[PDB]
Amino acid sequence: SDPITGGHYENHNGYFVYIDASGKQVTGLQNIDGNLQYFDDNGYQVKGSFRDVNGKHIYFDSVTGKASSNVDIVNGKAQGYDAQGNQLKKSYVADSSGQTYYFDGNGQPLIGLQTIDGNLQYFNQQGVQIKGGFQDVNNKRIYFAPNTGNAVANTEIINGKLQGRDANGNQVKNAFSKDVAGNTFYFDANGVMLTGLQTISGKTYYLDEQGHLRKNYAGTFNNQFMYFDADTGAGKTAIEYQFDQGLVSQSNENTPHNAAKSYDKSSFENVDGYLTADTWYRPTDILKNGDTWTASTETDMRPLLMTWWPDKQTQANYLNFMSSKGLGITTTYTAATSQKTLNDAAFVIQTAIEQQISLKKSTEWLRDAIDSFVKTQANWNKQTEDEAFDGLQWLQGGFLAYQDDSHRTPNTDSGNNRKLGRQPINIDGSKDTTDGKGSEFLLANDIDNSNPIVQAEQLNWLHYLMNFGSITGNNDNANFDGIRVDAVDNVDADLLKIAGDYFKALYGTDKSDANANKHLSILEDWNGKDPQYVNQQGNAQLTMDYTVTSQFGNSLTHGANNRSNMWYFLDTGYYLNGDLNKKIVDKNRPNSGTLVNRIANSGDTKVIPNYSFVRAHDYDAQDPIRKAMIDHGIIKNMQDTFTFDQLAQGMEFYYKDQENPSGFKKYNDYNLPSAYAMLLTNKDTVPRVYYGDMYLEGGQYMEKGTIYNPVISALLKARIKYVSGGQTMATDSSGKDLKDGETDLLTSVRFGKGIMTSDQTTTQDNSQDYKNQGIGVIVGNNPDLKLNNDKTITLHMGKAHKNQLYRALVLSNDSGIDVYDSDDKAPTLRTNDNGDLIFHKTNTFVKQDGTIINYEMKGSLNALISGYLGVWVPVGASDSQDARTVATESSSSNDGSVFHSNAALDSNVIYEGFSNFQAMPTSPEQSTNVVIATKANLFKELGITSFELAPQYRSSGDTNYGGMSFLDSFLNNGYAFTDRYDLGFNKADGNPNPTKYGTDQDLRNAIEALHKNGMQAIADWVPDQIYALPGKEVVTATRVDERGNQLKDTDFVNLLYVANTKSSGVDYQAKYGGEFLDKLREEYPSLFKQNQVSTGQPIDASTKIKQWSAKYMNGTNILHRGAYYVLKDWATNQYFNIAKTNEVFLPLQLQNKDAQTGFISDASGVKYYSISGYQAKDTFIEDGNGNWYYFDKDGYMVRSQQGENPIRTVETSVNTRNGNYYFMPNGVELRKGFGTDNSGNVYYFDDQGKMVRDKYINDDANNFYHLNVDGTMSR
Amino acid sequence: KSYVADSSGQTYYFPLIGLQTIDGNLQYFNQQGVQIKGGFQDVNNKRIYFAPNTGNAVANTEIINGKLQGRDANGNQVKNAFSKDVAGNTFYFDANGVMLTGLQTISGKTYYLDEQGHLRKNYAGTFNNQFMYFDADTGAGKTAIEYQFDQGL
Ligand SMILES: OC[C@H]1O[C@H](OC[C@H]2O[C@H](OC[C@H]3O[C@H](O)[C@H](O)[C@@H](O)[C@@H]3O)[C@H](O)[C@@H](O)[C@@H]2O)[C@H](O)[C@@H](O)[C@@H]1O
Ligand SMILES: OC[C@H]1O[C@H](OC[C@H]2O[C@H](O)[C@H](O)[C@@H](O)[C@@H]2O)[C@H](O)[C@@H](O)[C@@H]1O
């Protein structure tokens, strides 16, 4: 049956009905939105029953009513059926009750013992499959498994003694047999389970008290050490050495030819002196064509992996890989293979390589082969990087923090800076040990904003933005007026003070409200305690108010059916006991509630100035738009890379869902009109409006308005005319739960300029402006709302509006929301003597001229609303009526603060005028900033006083040096950039090079156009990170989570890593970097003398940043290169280097010296030499068979002696490995198993050999053990 | 393009890593490629349970704090609906996510949940001080007043 959509589900008399988009009730079989369902003749849906349609017998599920497989007893007998209603043949089916039948070729269920798909199974007399139990068949007892139902060995307790049963149902005698859990036992000739130490078939096994065979178990059993095999549990004495590689010399006739020509940067490809897996070098000679050795020329570079390897495992893998590509006899080599054999095989590959170099006359084929091979190895890819996705790691897969390490990586030293997570609440580090430490790491290369030199540079950039027009076009009218601070909680909070004080110094923002409000500035500050901090610091930038944005989510914007009541908007707890009659403010509360109370806001109590919104470029947009693409198979993951075409296709589904006449929204937000009605009438806030609520978020800029555009436009124009004075807010509701009459309908009122209260009848200054001002808003979140016939709903418009005529601006109904542009076209209604507009279930309104209108207070459901919305305004409003307040030039306040929440500030409106998902301009004429210039007018008339423009910085684009790309970058939205000062300049060749939003001229014209129309322009200040830096450096790095704390179980600690941290040095950062600071220090000395809190220091302009590098960074997202891409000798743990001829370290082969490698015994003990020819000291070493050893400071393998404790405490150069290990007599480290000490105490040792303490531990067979704090096992 | 099982019984699918859906069944494989079976694993933002033998995604319940919670096949927590656990018990979870108990009327029909919160099917009882038989199919209360025989004399 063909699918349908857009018809809602209705419940009648306990049953589900489905009513079409046509609006007709549905009968019969129907595919609705990919689900196959049935309705009988009355139109009710069937669940948990079988129906017959066509030739099909189809069951429908008991919960969902969806077509799925079942078994029906048909006449006398069972018959299986599929999802489409076909009788099944030769298949298993599970019925409703979770029971399983197998129906044969004739579709009849099998009974008794059966062998299916090579599995033995049993069926009872009714055809049901036995699972999880014993069963006597053919005079034998067989156990059948819990879920498969397959025959398996098991044990049961007969009398008081355990007995064993095999897979064929025979009892076990003289053999090992398992149980379902996974424990092995041994049973003797008399059938009885054995215990303790037992020798069978010339081998010795250890069975514990429970009779469990113990594998990978070390202990003194015969008063002589004995290790029990991991494979079979058979006791070995652990006396024979298991390493297979004796000390051998590697040098031969090819050594001097393959040795390096030189020990320096000429002959070695490198980064900061160090070497990498894919380094190529210059050998002394070249085996050209595989025939004749000839001296090398400078260009004759060859891969290091042709000649050297870090270990035998890697060498064997290299040989196998290159073999497979036509270069030799294809080989299975292991680390266990002898060193001599591997080296010989490397040379035959070398020969073959030189032959294909002659044949192809190229080496690029080899570059690609080496690159490919290198990524295969775990040490050289992300597998050793501990990719994780929890927290902000979700974005890019994990972070590395750079470290101050002057001995190995001194260019990368931070000069003891790099304070992490100094967010506002942790500006002084006093919460460094808690979750109150800031998540310093977010995206890409995280800039160290705790460094005074970097702080100065951020100020330079800030100055450049605030004077962009003066500097780049000598146009003093093309300058940004204010800023948005991106990612406040992910940077050092000093930047807020730096920005604050700069604006104070240059614009006197702390002098007057007129100065302050000429340079509107906002914060992206998500932490719930940021508002109070920002206010203690004098409100230099406006905090967001998440408390109101949050409540829109809960009560209107999010969720089709279950929403928090409108009651929650009041925050009655603000008052003591919620006494709305008494109104005593609660001086002490448990850190809760909305930022600004609006129940009865007369402007008498000081409140924190703020901006607020319903949506943003980065709130309720990016996730929905992606969920939609995922839902339609366009991408698989949220982090997935997508193309612009992929985005366009997804956008079409998004738009379709947004504008759905059904009224249901899967990705999009509900009740946006109603949300904006509240946002735009609220006192004590600067509202912000999202481009994407006015125009479609994709495609071209301003290409097509949204369905919400008319309503929001009307609200915006009405805000200019009517919105002023005090506020009240109430609900027909007292809490979570609604009494009988209660509607939970919210009533919000504003009184008019100068009227602060319900009962205030006139202004104190006797101005008359108030009479035609004020506004009434009624909103509900219940689309199925029906009033009682008794019920009346009232708007207390106030005693300053007695007997006045009011007319509707906006009214909801069942097909949309009507908008009335002027008094004549709308229904009127008059207030009573007390100033109340009364509403009933049924209303008859009259138009001012003549005509009568009917209107029901009715919840509605359509694309524009799920609930109720009514807005009313006073008739008689002038055409040029303006209820806003101009800002005063006087020093109102001695509080030191910049912004003040008052009628003047409230007169502003910010427009966030871009969407992250805009398409790229198809032509220069449709570039965002060109369009903004032609359309500036339109925003003046909507009352926008400040225009928040997208970040104008040049996108880093598709560039990706390693690790996961982020959407900001590949969607070119401007948040991901390489050059902070390139805002759309031309290529140096003269050609245009626009951003996604147009050229730099387009931007200056756009900014000027906004000033010509009396609007400010906001610059997006993005100090937290920078993307895609083209130059490599070697850093010392630790793997960390978002707060810069080391991951708990990571070996990636203080390792050398190649990062991309260095800027081109020839970009606009190099031209403009630090240039404006000198002029500024001269003119405003105190900015440069004032100490910052987090550092104790003032900003430092003595050093200019023309080129970025790692010393100014805190870290990076993981780049997928590997923990040991920077090459290191395992024996000494020293990294190879060739930077300075005084302190060269290379493998001895490359210096034409003799490299001996292997294990060698002497009278004192065993020693080891690495492939590069160095002795192992104070390091762990792994042999070719996978066994691990520890070599002490003296260079000797640690091994247990007779009668002594095998447990040894290790403290190594490599700190991560510190801990207690268990070394056997032949030096092998015990791993993932229990070990007995000399005194009979048992301990456990983990995957990596370390002792485990103070925890419970589980076993594959479901055995549980407990380890005390001292390490011992109580069990 | 096949599953293989080790000596132990660990299972790979050739190997796929992470969240994948081989033959329409949702499975999770660890970073080393082993198939997750009989446990809750966290992928993305949604917790999912994978079945003991098959390893297929299924609804399950776990105890968070001291309260039972329900998880569906897609890894989303269940609110205002019936959801199963691996054993085969059905529960009902309210708008606040919490399991319901006792006699409950939802969507104009009445169901009986025992103390443990198990939905009882094919269960006869005087529940409202009046007889009520709870359906073998969905557990919905009928009065058992209509004759079910279909053949008149
Ligand atoms: O933030 C403004 C809001 O603050 C209080 O209400 C908070 C919250 O209260 C309801 O839900 C309770 C809520 O508590 C925690 O946040 C849990 O973690 C949530 O799961 C749980 O739902 C209400 O339903 C929410 O919408 C509301 O935000 C004030 O009491 C409110 O008046 C005020 O608007
Ligand atoms: O091929 C797998 C499996 O198919 C059937 O089992 C399916 C199903 O049966 C129950 O519902 C169990 O509780 C689940 O764990 C199972 O996946 C056959 O019965 C079985 O023999 C076969 O192995």
Ligand SMILES: OC[C@H]1O[C@H](O)[C@H](O)[C@@H](O)[C@@H]1O
């Ligand atoms: O059917 C073959 C089966 O092999 C395995 O046991 C896999 O775990 C399972 O997913 C698969 O279906």
Ligand SMILES: [Ca+2]
């Ligand atoms: Ca940061």
